[PDB]
Design a protein around this ligand. Structure first.
Ligand SMILES: [K+]
Ligand SMILES: [K+]
Ligand SMILES: [K+]
Ligand SMILES: [K+]
Lengths: 297, 296
């Protein structure tokens, strides 16, 4: 089954010396799409980008990775995002990725997956596109994966976040969150004191990440933990996207899913989450089918 | 006497190796400040930049060159400009654009204040510039208006003719380019337009001609200063280098007279060439300037 990712794609400039930036492809939604594609899965990107430099560059990157771009439109009246890893400093104000809208949605099919995060929720056009997209995917008999990739500093009135988060866990088949983001949401200092936070918001399945520590699967059979490989950081950029990437690649192999698949899924997550940190780009060390096993064992 | 430059400070991204850009210091007001500094003059930058990588990067370049940054304010809610060439922009609010009148320092007799239309395009910056010129004049100081016309960057191209004239009014000396004259006057030949600013209140005008040097317009008449012979390869930042060397001279005294004004333009043409011949950055140090003024 096909995995549809909707959201941001951008150029990330990460330093090296005391006078230069390394140009890498990026965007939470882009990283995830390229991750799922590289693992041999079938993935499609739904979004907007300007018909500019950054636009065509990132577009090309999708093609070189096997990511369907039929529904990725490039508007010349727009400018594609560019940030600088220093921990992010965004440069483009409205950000082309925020212009995607319900018209840009592809017809959905049974058992397919729809992915989106709060980043897709910041500005209006996109916001509608995401929530409608999830609505249609569920109506089509499909699954929605909401990654509450909380980006406080990107929002205009942080007084919309708690509300849009709840309406996503609602539509969401599976919600993925980080230890930090839970605390930062529940207002709690100990995530564990509020780890049924999303569940009580409408989502029955939660996958809470924990760094080089792994993840915590929270369904109803109980809380299951998974270990993260021996880390050796080089650039933490995109660990989270690689994690969700491997997660969808797996879930997408079946039509239905249970703890079983949910465990092989999270194992792939923790794995793809560790590797990616080894390189210096958000999606530089995203594994191929043959590089994943060599690292696995 | 100290030279105060107010305006743009941005990080220019230039292609390089493989999918890697390199930081380049830039900004008409920045280049000038660095120019004046390098030549062993006393210069201070008044402006804004984000406290982002760039913002702090630029502050460094200013320090490594002897440019006072006491009045260079680094905000957090702002974002320093960044351009990518191959000159497409990215940051539109523009941090350097948030500089305001309360970021201005105290001026003192015989000091120079510099600014261009680039500083006049967005709001806080615009007030900051006109107020800065007003104060420097009241302090018995000097103002150098460089009508560095950037039609594109301007939102309402109608505000330009008006802001240029109000500026000429405050200026002690106005610097303009041959084409810049044609743009405002609308004439094809600039000579038919050499009094455009004169009629706007500026008694002294320096019209840059590039390779042909420079024409000076004053009450007593106009005098031509030819340019040094060089292999023209890259004209970037030539204008900033020209104005930089110009301020570095007029400051070395209290009240420029026939002779100092005469030598200032020679420094300008000079500093303006080292640019077109070499690789901004083409700014020289006193040692290199001299070895050039001669056999070079
Ligand atoms: K749900
Ligand atoms: K990385
Ligand atoms: K005047
Ligand atoms: K040049």
């Amino acid at each position: 089954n096909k995995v549809w990712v909707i959201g941001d794609a951008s150029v990330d400039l990460v330093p090296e010396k005391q006078n230069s930036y390394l140009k890498c492809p990026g965007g939470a939604s882009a990283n995830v799409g390229v991750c799922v594609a590289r693992l041999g899965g079938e993935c499609g990107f739904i979004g907007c980008l300007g018909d500019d430099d950054a636009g065509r560059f990132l577009r090309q990157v999708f093609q070189d990775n096997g990511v369907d771009v039929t529904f990725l439109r490039l508007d010349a009246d727009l400018t594609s995002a560019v940030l600088i890893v220093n921990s992010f400093t965004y440069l483009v104000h409205p950000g082309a990725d925020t212009y995607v809208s319900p018209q840009d949605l592809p017809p959905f099919r049974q058992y397919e997956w729809f992915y989106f995060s709060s980043i897709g929720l910041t500005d209006r056009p996109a916001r509608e596109a995401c929530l409608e997209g999830a609505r249609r995917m569920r109506e089509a008999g499909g699954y929605v994966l909401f990654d509450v990739n909380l980006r406080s500093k990107m929002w205009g009135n942080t007084d919309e976040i708690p509300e849009l988060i709840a309406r996503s866990a609602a539509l969401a088949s599976i919600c993925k969150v980080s230890a930090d983001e839970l605390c930062q949401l529940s207002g709690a200092s100990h995530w564990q004191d509020a780890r049924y936070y999303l569940r009580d918001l409408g989502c029955d399945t939660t996958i809470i990440s924990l760094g080089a520590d792994g993840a915590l699967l929270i369904t109803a059979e109980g809380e299951f933990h998974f270990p993260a490989p021996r880390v050796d950081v080089v650039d933490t950029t995109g660990a989270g996207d690689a994690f969700v990437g491997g997660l969808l690649f797996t879930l997408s192999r079946a039509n239905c899913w249970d703890h079983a698949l949910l465990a092989e899924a999270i194992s792939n997550a923790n794995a793809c989450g560790a590797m990616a940190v080894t390189a210096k780009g958000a999606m530089t060390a995203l594994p191929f089918p043959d590089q994943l096993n060599t690292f696995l064992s």
